[PDB]
Design a binder for this molecule. Sequence first.
Ligand SMILES: CC1=N[C@H](C(=O)O)[C@@H](O)CN1
Length: 257
Amino acid sequence: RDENKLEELKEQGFARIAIANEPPFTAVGADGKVSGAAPDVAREIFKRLGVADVVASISEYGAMIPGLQAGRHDAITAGLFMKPERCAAVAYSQPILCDAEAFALKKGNPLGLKSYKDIADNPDAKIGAPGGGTEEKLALEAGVPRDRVIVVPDGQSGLKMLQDGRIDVYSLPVLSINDLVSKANDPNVEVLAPVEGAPVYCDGAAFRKGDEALRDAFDVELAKLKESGEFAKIIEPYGFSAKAAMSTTREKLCAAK
Ligand SMILES: CC1=N[C@H](C(=O)O)[C@@H](O)CN1
């Protein structure tokens, strides 16, 4: 289950992957099929490694690394963006899904919220964000107090919380917000993208430190997918940029900048 992880996954027939259900990063249809850019890439690569299918678990973003280190899943494939502190806890693949950050906001933006700092500087402003995710951390880092950063389980709840006036802003990656609002059919909601002063992130498939040999194998296929253009064929129908991911590396994103 360490150096010989791939072998066991092959003779097991499947790999356990962690997702959050946030299109177009991850998605689950009523059928039960797991799609989205991250699981499709993960699915294709595992297939190439002799691993016949993926079995997915839904959880919130903050439970993913703990679940991985506890050995509950074989990889995180969910748009879990590379950050120094995350990089120190897992063995990431090379970059896959890149995106900026966005705001879902009341029409006309009554509070003038354009950066995470704007939220911090207004004591009335509450921001909705996934628990343990990048947006929550960026709000906290900009100086939004804990009790004004509100944990939101998923996009549909964030939208509803915004409509109810529980939050003044809901924050996800641009592609996630765009997808959510276009399906929302709500003239009172408005998108602000990208968030001013917020970093641009890329994710990878995240593995246990002791599963680095599996990570290497996954990466050999990722690199071949990138080289052929097949990588672009999988992720770009979802709105992602292949070039962005190919323009940087794990080490650059994991660097303390
Ligand atoms: C795809 C996605 N990634 C963020 C993260 O990696 O924390 C989450 O906070 C929100 N959605």
